[PDB]
Structures are given as structure tokens and as C-alpha cells.
Amino acid sequence: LHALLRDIPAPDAEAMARTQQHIDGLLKPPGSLGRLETLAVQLAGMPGLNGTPQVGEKAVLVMCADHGVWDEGVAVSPKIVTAIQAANMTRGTTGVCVLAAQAGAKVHVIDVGIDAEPIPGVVNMRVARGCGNIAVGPAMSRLQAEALLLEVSRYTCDLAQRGVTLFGVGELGMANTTPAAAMVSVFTGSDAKEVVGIGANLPPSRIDNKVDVVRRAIAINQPNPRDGIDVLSKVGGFDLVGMTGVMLGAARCGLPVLLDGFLSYSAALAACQIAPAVRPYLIPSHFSAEKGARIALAHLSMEPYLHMAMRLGEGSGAALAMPIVEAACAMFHNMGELAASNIVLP
Amino acid sequence: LHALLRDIPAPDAEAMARTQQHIDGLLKPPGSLGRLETLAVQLAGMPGLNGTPQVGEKAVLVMCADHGVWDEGVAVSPKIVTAIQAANMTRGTTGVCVLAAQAGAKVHVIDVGIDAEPIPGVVNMRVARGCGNIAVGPAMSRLQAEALLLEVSRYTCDLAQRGVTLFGVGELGMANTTPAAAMVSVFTGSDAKEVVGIGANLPPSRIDNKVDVVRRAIAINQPNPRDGIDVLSKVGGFDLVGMTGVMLGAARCGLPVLLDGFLSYSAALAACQIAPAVRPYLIPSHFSAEKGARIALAHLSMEPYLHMAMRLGEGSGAALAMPIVEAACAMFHNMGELAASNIVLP
Ligand SMILES: O=C(O)c1ccc[n+]([C@@H]2O[C@H](COP(=O)([O-])O)[C@@H](O)[C@H]2O)c1
Ligand SMILES: O=C(O)c1ccc[n+]([C@@H]2O[C@H](COP(=O)([O-])O)[C@@H](O)[C@H]2O)c1
Ligand SMILES: c1ccc2[nH]ccc2c1
Ligand SMILES: c1ccc2[nH]ccc2c1
């Protein structure tokens, strides 16, 4: 894992410079395509993309797992929904499945800790049947976190060897906005009250309890904010650890990763804390309607492209933004040039 | 034209109700897909869509024309660029062409007043070689505005009879952010200084002159803000009138129209002033980087889905948002249902 983190490549400034020069010469006022241009340049800096903004195969990795903190009454969805929805993922009927199909991407469902019998068709990487209840102790051991980070990292990179050039990250797990809020609070130094949201339609009257649970998780575990792995293992979860591993893996293979919503922000904070070299590979998708979204995004210095007030998860926002990444590539390669039209602008 | 405006259909509330009920039953927490859900319902209310959110063929109509106010030094792009870019539109090398192709939409280039010889391959609807300089008088006569509104309206609807169900609107015309600013100022009652932007890279030192030109256009023409056609004919332009006509035409044929950037906001303000019944058919795409964008959008009560800091025009933002409209349709038709999985949520 030390080797992994050490070998994350830095962006290729040379390729980025050639990209900018080319974009500036396209048939349009310089900078007129705004963020689509900066995105194209960002992609050109990623080693796995071969010095140019391009998208080959697309994949969305969905990490599924249950949480012991569910027993604290922080979620209104039945616990079994995690298992049920993971099965639906293999049938193509879920929100991320439909959006991914629309984007021409394949969905990979990975079980990293669902509390139920193994589901056929789902990639098996389960650590245990659900993680520990963060309200009274740690979610898992540091070793369990490190092993899963490594496992997921290799899997992610291995796909790269099969033509995948763009990754999307997602999750599935009832009650996971609680550990996500705890992590955000710890990494950003914000009070729990500022970061706790309604998750999957939690009644307004039950918010206070959720805020209390988050505070207890932090007080009892005392996670070290300067150690991302310590935070993930103490107040995080298997699904959040797995999302973090996708990001470290893609970064190691020099490829881009599209974040999703609130849960993915938490994992991204952890990943950047663990290895700052990961930041250049992250691409925001949408702006989650979860309460703590603004704060999490601020500390990541990211501005989502899409404002859809979405809060489903599963990597649905990630899939929805894939066409945008392809648009930046299409702009770069298919547009004509000013010089070819004898057009000169001041 | 009176018949046209009178026959614009009202949204089908019955179909909208059936849509909501169906969306609420999909495999996800109610309302979790946010704006994607409201969009699907909006589409279901449009008569030309046959009671359901669906997208058949897609088209982007680009209105090209020159402006006499160009001589006032409000634009740094050579006047000929309008003609050159219109030709490029027929070659598929422009920004909107590339983005439209990515979205599977066809681009229609319509010349409503380019100041140059006719361009082969471009739909010919030219009113004159450029409109009058709004700084010293009106852009055109009221009759010329009304005739073009009617012409463009019929053309738009006629395409509907060929399978088009989703329209995108766009323009091309050096100096057109000046008349667009004048219109916005008049419709919203905002001072010119608050609505004038840099358009296509206008140097910061030349802004003052642009603000002055806008004020003179308004003082000299005295456009009536309660008469959208009066405003368009006095301080607008052929291209802006044509965009307005696309919106009235699509609304008349009960179909959706995707706005683009700043210029399209102006036209949309005019259209809604002329016929409020048009509003339900308009769908925002992105948030233009032009200075007066926020104000224009506020008076239209619209919140764009995309924040790309784009300011190219051509209908490029419109094309970029088409995949989003299709996503709402895909969600509606392809997702599974909660009941089928025996999932019950409070
Ligand atoms: O991605 C988001 O921003 C998001 C925001 C709120 C809720 N969710 C989803 O809803 C679940 C977490 O909600 P909850 O109330 O059980 O903590 C989980 O399975 C996520 O996929 C996802
Ligand atoms: O769509 C926008 O928001 C937009 C904002 C700024 C500039 N433009 C484009 O640039 C041109 C208008 O800029 P200008 O400086 O000549 O007034 C015109 O051809 C538009 O297509 C377009
Ligand atoms: C200068 C060059 C290309 C362009 N496309 C749209 C406006 C514009 C201005
Ligand atoms: C309840 C029902 C379906 C779901 N998909 C993702 C979270 C979730 C909760």
C-alpha cells in the first residue's frame, strides 16, 4: 500500500500545455467554452490517457455494504433494502443502471460488506456482514481498511488494462450518510449540526438523534483527522473505504474518476488526506442536495457541473456527467481551427 | 399571428398527475432524483409529447444575422465572422455542430439577416443585410418583426411533423450581446450597467462605451416593456426575433425548447411577455458567464442545470443539455418499481 501511494503519477504538464495551445486555436473566442476547456486540459494531464483528452470504455463501480449504526435509528429504509437493491443492480433496473446504459457505461456491483447471504452476479469482496456500530466503537480494524483499500485499488486498475479509461464511483448502504457526516465533520472541522442531512428522507423530527449519534461516534472513537485511514476505519464504513480505494486505484493507473454525491465527497476527502496526489484525477459531477454538500465541496475546492438536487446515490450523478466528459473530448478533436478560416481575433 | 398565439395549448395536468404517481413508485426514495423528476413531469404535460416524457428526433435551430450597432465599436470580432461561421455550420466544424453530433441532434442554420451574399446550404429567411443600428433608431419595423416571427414559427412546427420532439435554440451574430443587454434592461427594469457583459472577449476598457450605447438605444427608441414585439423591433435584432419565433412555434406545436445562453434569455423574456402560455415549454440548459445572466434568469424564474461558465452561443449549451432531457425519459421508462421488489418506505 505504501508502494501504491508512492507510485501515483504526477500530471503531465507538457501534454497539458499542448492541449491548451490547441484549444486556444479552435473555431471560437478564446476561453468561450469555459469549464469544458479546463476539463479537456485536466484530462490531457492524466498519464493513462496518452497525452490527449479521450474516453474509451466507461465503468461505474458501486460499493455495497451495511452499517451497524443502522440500529441507532438514523435511517427509515429497512436494512434489507441494501441486499435487495444490490440484486436489482444485476438486473439493470436501478437508477444508476438506467443512467449508465444511457451513457454507454457498464456498472460493476461490488459487495464489500452486505449483511445478508452472498448475491450471485455481484463481485464478492465482503469484509464482514456489515461494519461495527460507530456509535459505540470503530467500524472496523485499521488492517481491514488497508486490505480493502488495496483489494479495490488493484481491481480498479485491472479494469484499466481492459480498455476502461473513465471511472465513476458509487455506493449502496442504508444509514451510510451518518458515517459520511462524521467523516466530513472530522476532516473539515465543522460541527455535526452543520453537516448532517436527511439522507434518504429521514423525518425532520429524527434529525436531532442523528446529530447526537454522529457526535458520539467522534467522541468515542477520537479519529485522527490527519490520518485518513484512521478516520475511515473508525467512523467510516466498508462502502466508503471501497469508494476511496477506487479513487486511489484510478489515480495510480493515471486515469480520471467521476465523483457522485455526498458519500463520494466523504471518501474523496479521505483519499486526498491519504495521498494529495490523488486530487488531480478527481472530477466532480453534480451538487448533492444533502445538507453538508457545500462544506465538503469547499474543502475539496470543487465546483460540480450539474445542479440537479439529486440525492439517490448509487453513482447515478457520476453516470449522468459522463456525457459531459465525452463532450470535452469531442470539442478538442472535432472542432475546426480559426487559422483554417482566416479568422483573426485580438 | 393572433391565431398563433391564441392556439398555444395549456399543459395537460392529467398526464402530469399520472406521471408523478408513476415516478413516485420507481425503485428509489421518493423525490431522490430531484430535478430529473420535475423535468420528466414537465415534459409529460406537453401535448406534442403524447402524455409521456419522450424524445424522438432532436434539432438545434441557429439564427444568424448581423447588426448595425456593430459600427459603434461594441464588438472586437470582425463583422465578416458572422458569414464565415454560418458557412462553417454547414461543414460541421463549429462548437454547436460538434456538441449536437454528440447528442444525436441535427443543426439547422437559418439566415435571417446576414450582411453578405447568400450562403449555399443555409436556410434562407433573410429580412435584410443586417438590422438597423439601434443606437440611432430602430433595428427594424414592427411588421418585419411580426412577419419573421410567423415565418420562423411555421418552420419550427413543420419540423415537428417530421419527427422532431425536442428543440434547441441558438444564434450567431457579431455584436448581438448589445441588443440582448438592451432588451434585458427594458424587460427587467435593471440599469444597463448591471446587464452589460464582455460578450465575445470585449476588453474591459471598452465596457463603458457599450453601456452608453445601450442607454442611447433605449432613450432614442423608447421601447414599451409591456409589448414584447415593440421591444424586439426597436432594440432587438433579426437573430433575436428568430429565436423568439422558435419558442412560439414549439409552444404552439406543444413541444419543448431548450434555451441556450444570454442571447436566448433575452428572446425568452420577449416570448413570455408576448405570450405567457409559452413559459411551460421552456427548459433551461446552462448558466451563461455573461454578466446579466443572473438577472435575466431571475425574471424568467429559471435555474439552469449546467454551470459550465460557457459563453460561446450557437446553441452549444442547448445541445449539451439534450442528454439530460433524455435521461429523465430513460429514468421514467426503464427504472423498476418498488412494489415489484416488495420494498415499502414510510
Ligand atoms: O449521494 C447522495 O448525495 C445521497 C444523499 C442521500 C441519500 N443517499 C442514498 O441513500 C442511502 C443513505 O441514506 P440514509 O438515510 O440510509 O443514511 C444510501 O444507500 C445512498 O445511496 C445518497
Ligand atoms: O450565449 C452566450 O451566453 C454568449 C455570451 C457571449 C458571447 N456569445 C457569442 O458571441 C457573439 C456575441 O458577442 P459580441 O461581443 O459580438 O456581442 C455571438 O455570435 C454569440 O454567439 C454568446
Ligand atoms: C468569433 C469567432 C467564432 C465565433 N463563434 C461564435 C461567435 C464567434 C466570434
Ligand atoms: C431505499 C430504496 C431504494 C434505494 N436506492 C438507494 C437508496 C435507497 C433507499
Q: Which residue has the cell 456593430?
A: B70
Q: How far is it, in rounded angstroms, from Cα B344 to Cα B334? A: 20
Q: How far is it, in rounded angstroms, from Cα A155 to Cα A138? A: 26
What is the grid cell recorded at B156?
Answer: 419550427
Please answer yes or no on whether A308 and B311 come within 8 Å at the CB atom.
no
Cβ atoms of B144 and B27 closer than 8 Å? no
Q: How far is it, in rounded angstroms, from Cα A165 to Cα A159? A: 9
Strand partners, B166: B58
Return the ligand number nearest the Cα of A181. 1
Helices (H), chain B: 2-6, 13-24, 35-44, 81-89, 95-103, 142-160, 177-188, 192-195, 207-221, 228-235, 238-252, 262-274, 293-300, 316-334
Cβ atoms of A318 and A260 closer than 8 Å? yes
Q: How far is it, in rounded angstroms, from Cα B244 to Cα B307? A: 24
Instruction: Please work out whether the CB of residue B81 comes within 6 Å of at least one atom of ligand 3.
Output: yes
What is the grid cell recorded at A127?
Answer: 469484509
Tell me which residue of B287, B40, B342, B2 sits closest to A35, measured CA to CA: B287
Which of A93, A102, A344 has its CB closest to that of B27?
A93
Binding positions of B for nicotinate beta-D-ribonucleotide: 171-177, 200, 262, 288, 311-312
Please answer yes or no on whether A98 and B334 come within 8 Å at the CB atom.
yes
Please answer yes or no on whether B102 and A311 come within 8 Å at the CB atom.
no
DSSP codes, A63-87: EEE-BGGGGGT---S-TTHHHHHHH
Domains and CATH numbers, chain A: 1-54+327-346 (1.10.1610.10), 55-326 (3.40.50.10210)
CB under 6 Å to ligand 2: residues? B 75, 77, 171-178, 199-200, 202, 260-263, 288, 290, 311-314
CB neighbourhood size of B6 (10 A): 10
Measured between beta carbons, the chain A residues lying within 8 angstroms of B321 are none
What sign does the CA torsion over A182, A187, A191, A196 have?
A: negative
Instruction: State the burial class of residue B346 (Cβ atoms within 10 Å of its Cβ: 0-12, 13-18, 19+).
Output: exposed
Please answer yes or no on whether B84 and A344 come within 8 Å at the CB atom.
no
Cβ atoms of B172 and B84 closer than 8 Å? no
Binding positions of B for substrate: 85
Q: How far is it, in rounded angstroms, from Cα A169 to Cα A155? A: 13
Closest atom of ligand 4 to CA, residue B27? 3
Strand partners, A337: A26
Q: How far is it, in rounded angstroms, from Cα B73 to Cα B342? A: 67
Instruction: State the burial class of residue B146 (Cβ atoms within 10 Å of its Cβ: 0-12, 13-18, 19+).
Output: middle
Would you give the DSSP letter of residue B286? B
Which residue type does A35 have?
Answer: R
Give every CB contact of residue A131 below 8 A, 6+ residues apart in sequence.
A65, A66, A67, A68, A113, A139, A140, A237, A238
Q: What interhelical angle do B142-160 and B238-252 show, nearest 10?
A: 40
Give every CB contact of residue A244 below 8 A, 6+ residues apart in sequence.
A149, A228, A232, A267, A268, A270, A271, A274
Strand partners, A257: A167, A282
Minimum distance, in Å, between the CA of residue B98 and any CA atom of chain A: 6
What's the CA-to-centroid distance between B78 and ligand 3, angstroms?
9
What is the grid cell recorded at B37?
Answer: 423528476
CB neighbourhood size of A113 (10 A): 27
Which strand (E) or helix (H) includes residue B326? helix B316-334
Q: How far is it, in rounded angstroms, from Cα A49 to Cα A67? A: 37
Would you give the DSSP letter of residue A36? H
Task: Classify B98 as helix, strand or coil.
Answer: helix
The dihedral over CA atoms of B150, B155, B161, B165, expressed in degrees to the nearest 10, equals: -100
Which of B32, B93, B336 has its CB closest to that of A311?
B32
CB under 6 Å to ligand 1: residues? A 75, 77, 171-178, 199-200, 202, 260-263, 288, 290, 311-314
CA A98, distance to chain mean position in Å, is 19
Marked catalytic residue, from B37, B72, B151, B314: B314
Catalytic site includes residue B151:
no
Minimum distance, in Å, between the CA of residue A39 and any CA atom of chain B: 10
Identify how the structure was determined.
X-ray
Q: Which residue has the cell 469544458?
A: A36
